Pancreatic polypeptide (Meleagris gallopavo), 72 residues
Amino acid sequence: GPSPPPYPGDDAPVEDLIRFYDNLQQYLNVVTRHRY
Amino acid sequence: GPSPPPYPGDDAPVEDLIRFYDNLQQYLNVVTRHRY
């Protein structure tokens, strides 16, 4: 949600990287309400 | 592009986090060609 996403080091597996994408796009959509 | 994005530690400033979003969505769009 509007929280910092867990960083699985330097190389995350693409599934969890997609999960990271979810949390990241959500976080950014919150802190910066603009479409990217 | 289709390369691993630079991780600015655990907390990145939202501008560079948006840049990270660009590289990340590009990377994911390459490795996993599906809309998210």
Notes: Residues 1-36 of chain B form one domain. The interface with chain A takes residues 4, 7, 10-11, 14, 17-18, 20-22, 24-25, 27-28, 31-32, 36 of chain B (CB under 8 Å).
